[PDB]
Amino acid sequence: LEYNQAVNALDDGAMEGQNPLTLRSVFSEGFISLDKADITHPDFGIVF
Amino acid sequence: LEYNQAVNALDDGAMEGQNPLTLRSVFSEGFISLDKADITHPDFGIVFSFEDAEATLAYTEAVNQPKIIPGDTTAHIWGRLISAPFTEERTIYQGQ
Amino acid sequence: RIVLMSTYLTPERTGCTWEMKLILDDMASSTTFDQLKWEPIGNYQDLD
Amino acid sequence: SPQGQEPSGGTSYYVSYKYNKRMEAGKDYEVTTQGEGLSKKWYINFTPSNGAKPIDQTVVLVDYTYYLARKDSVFINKYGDIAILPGEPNIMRLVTPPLNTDPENLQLGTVTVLPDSDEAVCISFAITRLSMEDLQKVKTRVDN
Amino acid sequence: MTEAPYNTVRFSYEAFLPKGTKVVPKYSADDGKTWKTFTKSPTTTRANNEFTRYVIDEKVKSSGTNTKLQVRLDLSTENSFLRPRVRRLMVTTRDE
């Protein structure tokens, strides 16, 4: 999994990939991480 | 996740482009191995740090064992060992 | 660069501090162990 | 008095130089802070408010006191005679562990008592119980 | 690269260079014979809260493909304590 982590971080790192960079960037949320929850939008009437 | 990742390699002989299809292949280095390093190129001179995953310029490893000023050293040099200043005391005696 | 890899036991009710008075090739001629203080070093870990 | 050539009193005459002024506190530098937490730092702002500053890209040199952190290696023993061992005092960069070898007091790491303060940090070569910390070494790279 | 012959190399790599330290990023598409500096410049982006990443991308064979290669970082400095530091080499050989 760490060989595969180096392949992904360095060789997906190297791209020549996707449709080059059509997709710019990503956000992801399991409904689990304090740093991706915006509780500073106290609109957050929800529980993980 | 490893056998779903193995399944991704079982897509990847067949995957549709993955890229558009442009990828040739990658040479890549994380500085915990000798296998991508051309140390046989004798101008090579880095010091990879083998779980730390970084290197810098190679180093001259100047090892020293310090040497003792025996008076200023209040410590008794206990044979090979070194120990505080002491007197003896007779902790035990049987006199029969 | 530097290392301490001296070796000892400090039993309980004992202690072993390790220190240098470092005159440097980075320092002037008169700078000697009078002017230097006991500057401490950690064992089994690298130092600069 | 070496008796070469000289100006008059009323010839348009002057002297000029860069001078190493003793730069003055608040006058020639305020201090401000930037970066915080694991990055908390201080800045001799060559007073953007007040400064008789040097010329741009001509020297500044600063004297100051600051707090050492202290990397208090803490350990526990066969009935709580804890080696609460106060650490090597240095800045947090390499505030460093006294590597205690009391054979009762077990390696828990360090209560790194904070600079100008009290608290704790543990980034170390120090190893706790039988490397069973391996469990998290594994789970971390999994979680990456 | 006879597995995927390359006209192009993205010599992407990562280094924290202290003051005045260097890496020269190089290829010898002739497998380590003539150390050519990468003739198309790295995108010297800040990598993270420390390092610079250095995304070269370059038609290293101008005229069809190289089938083979060597690539390099010439770590170098003004003193033994300004030490250039290196990680995350990310070299797609490429055919674009």
Please classify residue D108 by burial: count the beta carbons closer than 10 Å to its beta carbon, then call 0-12 exposed, 13-18 middle and 19+ buried. middle
Output the DSSP codes for D34-90.
Answer: ES-GGG-EEEEE--TTT-----TTS----------EEEEEEEE-TTS--EEE--BEE
Listed resolution, Å? 7.3
Q: What is each CA distance from E83 to B38, C26, E19, E86, E87, in whole angstroms?
A: 20, 16, 9, 10, 13
Please give the sequence-ordered ranges of beta strands (E in DSSP) within B1-96, or none if there are none: 25-29, 55-56
Q: Is the distance from CB of D46 to CB of D60 less than 8 angstroms?
A: yes
Query: Closest chain B residue to C10 measured between Cα atoms?
Result: B83
Residues written for chain D: 144
Tell me which chains share at least 3 CB pairs under 8 Å with chain D.
A, C
Please classify residue E76 by burial: count the beta carbons closer than 10 Å to its beta carbon, then call 0-12 exposed, 13-18 middle and 19+ buried. middle
Q: Is the distance from CB of E57 to CB of E77 less than 8 angstroms?
A: no
Phi, psi of E76 (to 5 degrees): -160, 155
Which positions in chain A touch E91 (Cβ < 8 Å)?
14
The tokens 């990397």 sit on which residue?
D71
Instruction: Kindly state the helix (H) or strand (E) to which residue E56 belongs, with its residue range.
Output: none
Half-sphere CA count of A23, side-chain side, radius 13 A? 9
Which among B25, B27, B57 has the least Cβ separation from residue E75?
A: B57
What's the alpha-carbon Rg for chain B, to the nearest Å? 31
How close C28 gets to chain B, by Cα (Å)?
A: 22
Strand partners, D17: none
Query: Closest chain D residue to C46 measured between Cα atoms?
Result: D125
Query: Under an 8 A CB cutoff, do C40 and D101 touch?
Result: no
**Rounded-to-integer distance, Cα D93 and Cα D115, Å:** 11
